[PDB]
Amino acid sequence: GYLLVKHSQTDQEPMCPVGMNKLWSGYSLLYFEGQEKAHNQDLGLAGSCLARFSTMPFLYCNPGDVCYYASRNDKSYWLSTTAPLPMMPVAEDEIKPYISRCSVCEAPAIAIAVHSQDVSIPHCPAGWRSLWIGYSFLMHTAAGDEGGGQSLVSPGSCLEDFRATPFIECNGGRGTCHYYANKYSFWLTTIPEQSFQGSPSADTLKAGLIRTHISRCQVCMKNL
């Protein structure tokens, strides 16, 4: 029994497709950052759907039989909403409309993400049905060199709504979340060529002319 994982990218939880029973809803976890070492959850797998949000949802222990919770300088990263980018770090309850919501459903068949690397939406392979259309989400970096990435076969590389900042940084100790200037989102490109590109021409894109250069995707489910 395959598990389908949707990310709404809004403060409201997404509905499971018709026939598929919802196991649980939660908050869209991108990655933890313990000891300035990022550990990621794949957005296509149920582990990215953490039922309960916290700025610090983890603790750490050492071989001295001592454990610390929210005592050092650790981080957590969560998928973001359209909510206006705050001028100053949001705090306690005002964090709610910034964190994306998720749903884990019970699928009869395995779901896969297919990428076109082109402006046009890819059609699902023969014997497969479409679930959603999105944009090709590859990888991310935030604090230092740290971040992680999505798997291109996994439905988590196919975000329904494109955002240059699809994730928010939650400082675990201070209990605040904020967008910072070093947050990068990486997306597969549109290649005008059939299957091979030789020498890429560098380009800088302002708001409005971006989306026509992002690769498009479809999440498809096998027919049974």
Binding site: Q35, L59, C67, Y68, Y69, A91
Partner: protein, 226 residues
């Protein structure tokens, strides 16, 4: 049976029994992660790649572009899940056959349907989804960092995020030199217990000594369909 696989880790020198409903493929030793050229690559504990039939402090080699392969010839690491075996009363590195009582054993089992792990985020056990039967219960094991703050982690949906026995030091650091030891920087990260009301509140700093460690550690259960 469509070929689904589940890996169990005993965290002792004894082979873990395949959970009810599954059949045994092969036994081995619990590999957490390797480190070569000072970069960590890990194997998810729920997957069969964390279960190697043969142990070595150096279970890998590297090759360069000039067709030269070096084995146990630089400064590289391998990490294995550890037993309850107490640290020697000198903290001096463990060499040779004295390492065997420290390394955990694993079992790769074939499941008829998909295997998954649920997390409660409380001291209570998370219930299996409706129509899924329980295999084992444990503690939410997320990630780890040892040498140079390099390490790896576990997917929270994967059974490998559910260690049956909570350990302060769940893994031992082994070297290409043939030495294994625990180190002060070998951190292990676990999902914290949070309450629904506390979710958006500023977290309260907590420090836990021997007897209070599992107080803030979330629980987990590994479930299987049909």
């Amino acid at each position: 049976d469509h070929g689904f696989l589940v890996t169990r880790h005993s965290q002792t020198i004894d082979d873990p029994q395949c959970p009810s409903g599954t059949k045994i493929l092969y036994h081995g030793y619990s590999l957490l992660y390797v480190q070569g050229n000072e970069r960590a690559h890990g194997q998810d504990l729920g997957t069969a790649g964390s279960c190697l039939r043969k142990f070595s402090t150096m279970p890998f080699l590297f090759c360069n572009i000039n067709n030269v392969c070096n084995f146990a010839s630089r400064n590289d690491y391998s990490y294995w899940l550890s037993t309850p075996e107490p640290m020697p009363m000198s903290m001096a590195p463990i060499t040779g056959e004295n390492i065997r009582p420290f390394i955990s054993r694993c079992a790769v089992c074939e499941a008829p349907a998909m295997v998954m792990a649920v997390h409660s985020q409380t001291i209570q056990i998370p219930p299996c989804p409706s129509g899924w039967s329980s295999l084992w219960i444990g503690y939410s094991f997320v990630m780890h960092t040892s040498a140079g703050a390099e390490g790896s982690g576990q997917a929270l949906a994967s059974p490998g995020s559910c260690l049956e026995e909570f350990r302060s030091a769940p893994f031992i650091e082994c070297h290409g030199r043939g030495t294994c030891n625990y180190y002060a920087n070998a951190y292990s990260f676990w999902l914290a217990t949070i309450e629904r009301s506390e979710m958006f509140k500023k977290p309260t700093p907590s420090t836990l000594k021997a007897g209070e460690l599992r107080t803030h550690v979330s629980r987990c259960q590994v479930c299987m369909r049909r």
